Structures are given as C-alpha cells and as structure tokens.
Amino acid sequence: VYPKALRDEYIMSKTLEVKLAFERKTCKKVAIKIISKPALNVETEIEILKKLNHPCIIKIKNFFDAEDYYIVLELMEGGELFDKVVGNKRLKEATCKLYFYQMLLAVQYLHENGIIHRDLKPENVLLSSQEEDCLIKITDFGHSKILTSLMRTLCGTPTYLAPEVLVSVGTAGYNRAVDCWSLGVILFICLSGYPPFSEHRTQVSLKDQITSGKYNFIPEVWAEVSEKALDLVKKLLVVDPKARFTTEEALRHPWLQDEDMKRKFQDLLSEENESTALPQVL
Amino acid sequence: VYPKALRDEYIMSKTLEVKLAFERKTCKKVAIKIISKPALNVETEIEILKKLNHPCIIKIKNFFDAEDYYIVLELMEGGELFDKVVGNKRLKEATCKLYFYQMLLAVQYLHENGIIHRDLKPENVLLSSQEEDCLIKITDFGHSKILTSLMRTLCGTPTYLAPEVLVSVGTAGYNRAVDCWSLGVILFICLSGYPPFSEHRTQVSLKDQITSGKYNFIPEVWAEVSEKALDLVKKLLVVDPKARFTTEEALRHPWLQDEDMKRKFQDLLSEENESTALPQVL
Ligand SMILES: NC(=O)c1ccc2nc(-c3ccc(Oc4cccc(O)c4)cc3)[nH]c2c1
C-alpha cells in the first residue's frame, strides 16, 4: 500500500519505478519515482534536486520517506529520449542540435555547481512534450557525485606520503569529463540511430572498443549527417580526459553556432515560463 | 572552559591538542584529545575506535560533543615514537624490530577490517612505557578511509561509460598500499635516524625523490644495520603499489622471523593483560 501521507496529497495512477499521479489540490499531473529500501543515494538526489534551479534540469515537488522512498517530480509529457532512438530510429539533425544544446546547458550548469551526473543516457533525458520541437530536462541524480583530501594532503609536507598520491595530482579534477564522454555517446546515437560501441558484428570486446576509442563508423549512415556534427562527436569521444572537450568548448563548437535553433529554444522556454510568471515592475 | 559533563567525570590537567586527565571514579590517568569545530573526520574516528579491538591499537574510553570535540583515550606513558627518533637519535635494531612487528600487526588488522589509516608517522605511534622494551599502539584515525561504486558500475553494461573508469579498474583495490609506504619510511627512520626523503643537501625536489623512489642512502650510517633489515625497507619503498610488500608479506620477511622478539612481545602483552583479566574456567 501507498503511505497515508502520500495518498493525502496525491492520487496515484499508472506506472510509466515511476508512476503517474495527480495533485489533489491542483489536479495537476506529477511523476513519482519509487525506490525500495541505500539512503545515501536517495539522500544525495534529494539534496541535489532541492538546490538546483535550471530549465533543463527536472524539479522536485515533494518527497516521502516511508515503507519505501517516494520522490515527486515534474511530469514530462514527452517521456524518455530513449523511446525516440530505440530500434534504430534516428532524429533529424536539427532536432539533435536542439536537444543537445539543452543537454550541454544542463551539464554545464551541473559542472559549474560542482556536481557530476555520472549516469547520462537517453533514458535519463526527458522531453517536455510529444512534439519533436520541445524542451528537454535531465533527471536521475542517484549516482551523482558532489565535489577534497588531496588538497589537504598537498598543504602538508609529503615526508611519509606514498608516490601514487603525488602522481595522482596530475590527473585530479577531471572527473566531470566522464559526463562529456556520455554526452558524446548520446549525440552519436541521436545522429546515427546506432551505438558507437557495441558487441554487434565485431570481434573486439566492448571494453577494448571503448578504451581504444575506436567507435564503429558506418559511412552509409553518416553520409546523411553534416561534417560539423560529426566533428563535435569526434571531439567528445576523445580517450584522454585532459584533451576531451568540456561543455564550454562544446557550446562554442561551430555546430552549435545556429541562431535559428537558439531562437526556437528561447521560444519554448518562454512558453513554459508563461502562466508561471508574475507581472513585472517596469 | 571545559564542558560541565566532562568536568563531572574527569579532572583536566597538563597539555601533552592532547592533555592529561584523571578519571574521578578510578583516579586513573587518561589522554584527552581536543578538536575545535569537521564533524565527519571526528565522526569517522569515533566510528572507527568504537569497533576496533587490538592490543596495538589505542582504545577510546569516552567522547564529548560540545563547544569543542573531546575524545578520551588510554594514556600511553611512553609518549610518541617521534620523540625517540627526532634529532638524529636512532633506536637499536632489535628495538626497531619489536616496534615494527607491532606496527605491522596493527596495520594488518586495520587492513583486514577494511580500514586505511592514511597518516602513519612516528607521532601517531604511541609507546606504552618509558622502557625501550614496551608495547606500541597506533592512534589518530581522523584521516582514515573505510572500504564501492566501481563494483556497481562493472555490473552494468558500459555502453555510456567513459574509458578512464574502465582503465581505473586495473589499479583499484590497492589503496591500503599507501599505509605500507608510510611504514617503510618509518622503519627507514627508526633504523638510521634520518629520513629517506628530504630537502637536506640535495638538488632534487622532495616530490621527485619520492616519485622516483630514490631515497638518500648513506653507507656509513647503514653499515651498522643488518642486510635483512635494509632488505625489508627496500621492499616496502617500492614505487609500484601492486609490487609493494603488503603487511602479510612483511610479516613473513626473514627479518621478522625472530623468535626472541616475538617472545618478548608475548610477555609485554601478558603483563598488560594481567590485572585486566578475569579468572578462567578450566
Ligand atoms: N529515473 C528518473 O529520475 C525519472 C524521473 C522522471 C521520469 N518521467 C518519466 C516518464 C514521463 C512521461 C512518460 O510518458 C508519459 C506517460 C503518461 C503521460 C504522459 O504525459 C507521458 C513516460 C516516462 N521517466 C522518468 C525518470
């Protein structure tokens, strides 16, 4: 059974673990994610969602800690990006750009605020409508990390410090680059309709494909895609973290210098804002 | 001022931040460590000390969380190992062996229980008496780490996983090796009376000395030390963590196959136990 306090504010409905629900007070739709009982993972997500404010990041509305873990969130009527790309379906380029531009803004915002998502994938990207022109929002912060001890060790004399810690200094502070990898893989999929790394018709093991950075390239498929779009993917799927493109570098790429796309984004953003916006002092 | 509850059980005395104190009930000496207010570091130490039980690991007796952080512990009348070695003083070999054997037992116990000290050094090693034949105990678990997510990532398909995480698998689970480095440096100091890595009369930077593993070797000094003892040091000051000696490998070294030393240890252990030991069913 659902906890009494939950039933008191919401009418639970169909499964979408995530199910649709209505807010009694307003009769509005909400999404409620359910997690059986890892307090820290849930605690981290709750901690993160409360403090964040960004159009391309999903908002928490309520939370209940009972027999299970119930998390109330905005409902995105478009569902998961995953459903758009599954089974070799491919989005048209301009649609990829509009979605990805928003994905970058979101992850940039996260990174600027010392948060690393660590689990970006099409099922964690939500669409705000059934229209293909729409707003996207990132979700699912269970696996996120918040940004130390190395800093603390460096302030002291390393008389007794093991050498592997000193060496590790050279690579520290590039954790957020993992998100940029996942982004590149998402963009590859969106643009082509198939994964860059897979155990389909290949002798090389998935791990080996990824570590070597040798994604499966199929000309026929990519022939329909621009060289700018592919270029950006090539810059995100860089094996070396230091060299890999950051969100900022991505947002400066010539593929995202598309004044139409940005305009259409402002529009969709404005429409969502309207009906939620108080009159302005002028 | 000291918190009322503290003064209620203890009479605070001289500074040794650590000061001597007496337990009202028993009139026994205790050591009380004081830390101004990093709850997590203190919390971790309290968490760790409560659960541990080992002769060469110091015991907590009480704790108070007030205007400051007060931690009550056993008093070691011998003070810090640091005072024995500071200013080029050097312990005789057999004394080094007896102390180090106990240091190994302690750190082995820690490691067996998923704890990494991370800050082993002569000031964190306490002597149970003013005699040079005595028991040692490790202390100060503020910086300790308790042993994951990598395991969790490996259970899933790495379709979106960045390559640096996969690579990191090859080096994971060797964190405890940092303690074995620190141990080697402690033993070097004890045996020779001088640090293996230092900015004394050398052009090479401390960091560079450590990463290259090239400790400063002074024949005249080491000529008085056995080849077995030096050998063990050479095996702990290995730059490569995988290859570095573990506590177990250390305890099997020919330098520690010394039946006299072990005997003298059993004795000291027995003496401490006596007066704390209930009559046995026989
Ligand atoms: N794991 C998450 O953090 C998370 C958080 C929130 C989520 N909302 C959906 C979702 C939304 C809409 C779907 O189609 C529908 C179904 C019913 C009505 C509707 O308008 C759209 C399907 C799934 N998936 C979510 C995942």
Ligand SMILES: NC(=O)c1ccc2nc(-c3ccc(Oc4cccc(O)c4)cc3)[nH]c2c1
């Ligand atoms: N940082 C720690 O975790 C810690 C924890 C416990 C510690 N006890 C001493 C210590 C003990 C004895 C000393 O000489 C004396 C002083 C008075 C009486 C006596 O018998 C010995 C000096 C320092 N240092 C400690 C450090």
